[PDB]
Design a protein around this nucleic acid. Structure first.
Ligand SMILES: [Cl-]
Ligand SMILES: [Cl-]
Ligand SMILES: [Cl-]
Ligand SMILES: [Cl-]
Ligand SMILES: [Cl-]
Ligand SMILES: [Cl-]
Ligand SMILES: [Cl-]
Ligand SMILES: [Cl-]
Ligand SMILES: [Mn+2]
Ligand SMILES: [Mn+2]
Ligand SMILES: [Mn+2]
Ligand SMILES: [Mn+2]
Ligand SMILES: [Mn+2]
Ligand SMILES: [Mn+2]
Ligand SMILES: [Mn+2]
Ligand SMILES: [Mn+2]
Ligand SMILES: [Mn+2]
Ligand SMILES: [Mn+2]
Ligand SMILES: [Mn+2]
Ligand SMILES: [Mn+2]
Ligand SMILES: [Mn+2]
Ligand SMILES: [Mn+2]
Ligand SMILES: [Mn+2]
Ligand SMILES: [Mn+2]
Ligand SMILES: [Mn+2]
Ligand SMILES: [Mn+2]
Ligand SMILES: [Mn+2]
Ligand SMILES: [Mn+2]
Ligand SMILES: [Mn+2]
Ligand SMILES: [Mn+2]
Lengths: 81, 106, 98, 93, 93, 105, 87, 98
DNA sequence: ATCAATATCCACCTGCAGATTCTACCAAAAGTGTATTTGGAAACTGCTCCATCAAAAGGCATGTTCAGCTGAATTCAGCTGAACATGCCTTTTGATGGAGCAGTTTCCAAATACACTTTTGGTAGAATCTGCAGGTGGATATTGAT
DNA sequence: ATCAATATCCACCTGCAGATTCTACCAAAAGTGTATTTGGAAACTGCTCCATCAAAAGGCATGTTCAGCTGAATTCAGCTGAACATGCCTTTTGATGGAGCAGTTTCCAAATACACTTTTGGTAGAATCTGCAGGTGGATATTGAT
C-alpha cells in the first residue's frame, strides 16, 4: 500500500528535471513537484470530465482532454484535434 | 467540371474550407473568395513547416518526418515558434540547451 | 573502483533526455493517479487510452517547461540547485499564483 | 466516416520535399496544426465582421485576420499566397 | 442609439445596497464586466454545442459553460440562480 | 403582455439577452431557456461584485462606488480575482501590499 | 496646408520620476540606475504591439480615426482585457 | 538640519501611490509618444482622446504589474534593488520576448 | 598538461518487425444551373469631435551635492545531495474473453423559426439634487538625533 | 528612554461638477398562428476498454561515502536615496474651423436557396520499407596519479 501520487517516483521527477536542464536537485523538490502535478491534473481532468458529462458519456475521450487543455491555454497537437 | 481548388491553383480543398466556415458559426454569409484565401493561407503555412521539418529530418539522416522533427523545426524558427508559443507537440521533446553556468570550468 | 565526480552523470543525463522524446513517468502509476483524481469528479468512469496518453503528454510537457523556468530562477539567485522556492517564484510569475 | 487534411498535407509534402515521408503521429500533429490555424483565422475574421456590423466574412476579413494573427514575415507571405489564389480563382471561368 | 445594462445594474445595486450610488466610470466598468462574462459564457456554449454536433444552445449548454468558466462557489450559486429562473419561467403562461 | 424577465423573476432583460444570443453567431438556433439562464447568471454575478464593491465604498466612508472600490472588492476576493485575473480595471489602482523584507528592522 | 512639427525622441518623455512612481505602485523600494532605459524599451515594445493591432482594426474599418474600441479590441487580442472604455 | 534615512521616503512613496489610482505618467508626453509610434506605423492618423487614455491605462497597468514581478525577482536574489536582470527574468517567465 | 585506465560515445553495417504506401470500390459532399433575395457600396450630408491655438501659472522635472547602507566580493565550514553498488518488486506486456458502451438508425412530440401585427420598456437629452474633492487647522503618530 | 522636525489623520465646511429624476418617442419586445426541425428515446450492434494472468525485466528503493555547494560572516567601495535650488513645460480653460464619422437612400453585384448531377475523399484489406535495436571496434572524455 502506497499513495498514487507517490507512485510518481523520485527518479521519474528527476528525469523530467533533466529534460528541463536541471543539474542539481534539492531534496524537497519531489514533494513540491508532486503537489504542482496534482493541481495540474485536477484542473485538466475536472474540465475534461465536465465535457464528458455534457456529452452524456461515461468514457473520457481524448478529444475531451484536448478541449480541456485548450480551455486552460495549453493546446495539445496530435490527439484528434 | 473543375474543382475550385484547381481553379485557385491549390492542393487544399477550397470547397471543404467553405463548408467548415459555414458550419463553424462565424457569420451569416460567407463570401466566395474567403474559402479560397483561407485555403491558400493554410496551404502556405503547411508548406512552410513541412519544408523546415523536412530539413530537420535530413539533418537527422532520416527520410520520414517525425514529431521530433516538427518540434526541432518549429522551435528553431523564430516566427513559427512565436505563432505556436502556447502549443504543445506530442512526442516532440525539447531543444538541447544547457545554461553555460552548469558546464565544467576547466 | 571508478567514480564520476558529482555533476558529471547529471550533465550526461541532461544531454540524454534532451535528445529523447520518451515519456519519463512510468505509464501504469500515472494511469492509476489519473483514474483516482478523475474518480473524485465522477464515478464509474472509463478512459480512452489515447486520452490517458494525451494527459501524460500534456503533463510531462508542462513539468519540463516549469523545470526550465525554475532552473532560471535558481540560477538567478546565484545557485545551481533548484529549490521549492524557485518553483514557487516561477509559478507566481506565470500567473498560476498570486 | 471521419475526415482530415491528411492527403492534402501529404501532397504538399511531396510538392516541397519529393523524397520525404511522414509518420502517422506526425500527420496527426499536422492535422491539429491546420485545424488550429483554421480556427484562429476564422474566429478573428468573425470578430472583425461583427465589430463593423457586417454579416459577411469576405476575403478581406481573412486578410486582416492573417495580418493580426501571423508574425511579420509569415504574415506577408500568407497575404501574398492568399491574394494570388484569389486572383487566379477570379481568373478561371 | 447606444444601449447598455445600466438600469438593470442600478436596479441590482439598489437591491443589495439601497443607500449606495455608483459613479459613471464605475458603471462603465460594470457594463464591460457584464458584456465580458456574457461573451465568455456564450462562446463556451457555442463551442460546446459544436463539439456534440448540436445546432441549439439550450439552458444545459449555458449551465456547463458556467461550470467551466466560473470558480467553485461562484459557479454553484450561478447554477442555482439559473435553474430557479428557468423553472420559474417554464411554469408561466 | 408579460415581460419574460418578470416571468423568470429577474431584473436583467431576458429578451435583450436572447436577441444578443441570436446576433452573436453562437449557434443556428437558441433555446428559450438559454437567455433566461444566462441573464440570471449575469444578474447574480453583477449582484456579487456590487455587494463586495458596496462594502468597499462603505469601508472608505463613501456613498458612491468608484472604480477603486470595484478593484478592491475584486482583488480581495479569491474567486472574483481568479475570474478576472487577466482583466484590467481602469482607474482601479492596486491593493496596498509591501513585501515584509522591505520594512525597517 | 501646414504639417505638424516632427515627432521624435518622445520616449524620453517617459521621465525618470514617472518610472519611479510606477515602480512605487509596484511596491518597489530601491531602483538601479539602469532600470529607466530598460523600462523605456519594454514600454515601447508594449505600445508598438498594441497600437499596431489597434491601427489594423482602424484600417479594416476604413477609418482614419483610432477609436477607444479599436484599442480595447487590440488589447483583448493580446490577453490584456480592459474595462472602462465602452468595452 | 533634518534628514530621513534612505528607504524611509521610498516606503512612504509606496504607501502613497498604492493608496491612489491616478495615472502616474504625464499626459501630454504620453500622447506625443503614442502619436509618434502610430505615425511610424501609419500616417495621417487621428486619435479619440479616450483611445489615448485607454492606451495609457493599459500601459501603466502593465508596467505596475511588471514591476511587482520584477520586485519579486530581486527579492529572490536576496536583493532590495530591482535591476534590468530582474525585469528580463520576469518577462522571460511570463513568455514575453526581447 | 601528459602517463595510464576505466567507461563513454561514435561509426559503420546489419536484419526485420512494425508501420507506411499502394490498390480497389461506393455514399457523401462538391459542383451546376436557376430563381431570388439581400447585404452594403456609392453618393450626399447633418454634426460630433478632433486638432490647433493662445496664454497664464504653478506643479514638477532636472541637475547637484553628499553620505548611508546596499550589493558584490571573499572566505570558509558543514552538511546536503550525487554517485554507485546491491538486491528486491512492481511495471510491462501480451493475448484473451467478456461485455459496457459509444455511434447510428428510426420515429414523432415538443420546441423553434417564421411573418405580421400591437404594445410597452429604455433611451436621449433637459430639469433638479447632492456627494465629495480641496482647503484649513489642530491632534496623533512616526522618525531620527543626543 | 526623551525631544524636535515633519508627516499623518480625522473632523468640519462649501460650492460644483457630476449623479439622479423627470418627460417624451420608437425601436424592440411580446403576442398569434402556421411551418419545420431537432434531438430525444427504445432496441441493437461492433469495439475499444476493463480485468486477470503470468511471467521476466529492468527500474526503483536502500545505504555509504564524501565532493562540492550553499549559506553565513565580514568588508568596503561606490551607487543610489534624500534634500534643495531653478526654471521649464505640462496642465487648464475656452474658442474655432473643418475633417470625418455616422445616418439615410438608392440599387445591383453577390450570396442563398433548392434540384440534380458528378466526383472525390474514406474505408478495409493489399504490398513494400525505414529505422531500431545490436554489435563490434575505434577514439573520446573523465579521473586519479609521474
Ligand atoms: Cl494549470
Ligand atoms: Cl433551452
Ligand atoms: Cl400550471
Ligand atoms: Cl496650472
Ligand atoms: Cl450490469
Ligand atoms: Cl420608462
Ligand atoms: Cl412607460
Ligand atoms: Cl426536442
Ligand atoms: Mn469573399
Ligand atoms: Mn468502472
Ligand atoms: Mn442588501
Ligand atoms: Mn445588502
Ligand atoms: Mn568505424
Ligand atoms: Mn505486418
Ligand atoms: Mn438591405
Ligand atoms: Mn563612504
Ligand atoms: Mn548587503
Ligand atoms: Mn561594489
Ligand atoms: Mn569538507
Ligand atoms: Mn551490483
Ligand atoms: Mn449493453
Ligand atoms: Mn479630502
Ligand atoms: Mn453642469
Ligand atoms: Mn530645469
Ligand atoms: Mn467632409
Ligand atoms: Mn475519382
Ligand atoms: Mn479519387
Ligand atoms: Mn478515391
Ligand atoms: Mn540504433
Ligand atoms: Mn541508430
Amino acid at each position: 500500500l502506497r499513495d498514487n501520487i507517490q507512485g510518481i517516483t523520485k527518479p521519474a521527477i528527476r528525469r523530467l528535471a533533466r529534460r528541463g536542464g536541471v543539474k542539481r536537485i534539492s531534496g524537497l523538490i519531489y514533494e513540491e513537484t508532486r503537489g504542482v502535478l496534482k493541481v495540474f491534473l485536477e484542473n485538466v481532468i475536472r474540465d475534461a470530465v465536465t465535457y464528458t458529462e455534457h456529452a452524456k458519456r461515461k468514457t473520457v475521450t481524448a478529444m475531451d482532454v484536448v478541449y480541456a487543455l485548450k480551455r486552460q491555454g495549453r493546446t495539445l497537437y496530435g490527439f484528434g484535434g | 467540371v473543375k474543382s475550385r481548388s484547381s481553379r485557385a491553383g491549390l492542393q487544399f480543398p477550397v470547397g471543404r474550407v467553405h463548408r467548415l466556415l459555414r458550419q463553424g458559426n462565424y457569420a451569416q454569409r460567407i463570401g466566395a473568395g474567403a474559402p479560397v484565401y483561407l485555403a491558400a493561407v493554410l496551404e502556405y503555412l503547411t508548406a512552410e513547416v513541412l519544408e523546415l521539418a523536412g530539413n530537420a529530418a535530413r539533418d537527422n539522416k532520416k527520410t520520414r518526418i517525425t514529431p521530433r522533427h516538427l518540434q526541432l523545426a518549429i522551435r528553431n524558427d523564430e516566427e513559427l515558434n512565436k505563432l505556436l508559443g502556447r502549443v504543445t507537440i506530442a512526442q516532440g521533446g525539447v531543444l538541447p540547451n544547457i545554461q553555460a553556468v552548469l558546464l565544467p570550468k576547466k | 573502483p571508478h567514480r564520476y565526480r558529482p555533476g558529471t552523470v547529471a550533465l550526461r543525463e541532461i544531454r540524454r533526455y534532451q535528445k529523447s522524446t520518451e515519456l519519463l513517468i512510468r505509464k501504469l502509476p500515472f494511469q492509476r493517479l489519473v483514474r483516482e483524481i478523475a474518480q473524485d469528479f465522477k464515478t464509474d468512469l472509463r478512459f480512452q487510452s489515447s486520452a490517458v496518453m494525451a494527459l501524460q503528454e500534456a503533463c510531462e510537457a508542462y513539468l519540463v517547461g516549469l523545470f526550465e523556468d525554475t532552473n532560471l530562477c535558481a540560477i538567478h539567485a546565484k545557485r545551481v540547485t533548484i529549490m521549492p522556492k524557485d518553483i514557487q517564484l516561477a509559478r507566481r510569475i506565470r500567473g498560476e499564483r498570486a | 466516416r471521419k475526415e482530415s487534411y491528411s492527403i492534402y498535407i501529404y501532397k504538399v509534402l511531396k510538392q516541397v520535399h519529393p523524397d520525404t515521408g511522414i509518420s502517422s503521429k506526425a500527420m496527426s500533429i499536422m492535422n491539429s496544426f491546420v485545424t488550429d490555424i483554421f480556427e484562429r483565422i476564422a474566429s478573428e475574421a468573425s470578430r472583425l465582421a461583427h465589430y463593423n456590423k457586417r454579416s459577411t466574412i469576405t476575403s478581406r476579413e481573412i486578410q486582416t485576420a492573417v495580418r493580426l494573427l501571423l508574425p511579420g514575415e509569415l504574415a506577408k507571405h500568407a497575404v501574398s499566397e492568399g491574394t494570388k489564389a484569389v486572383t487566379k480563382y477570379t481568373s478561371s471561368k
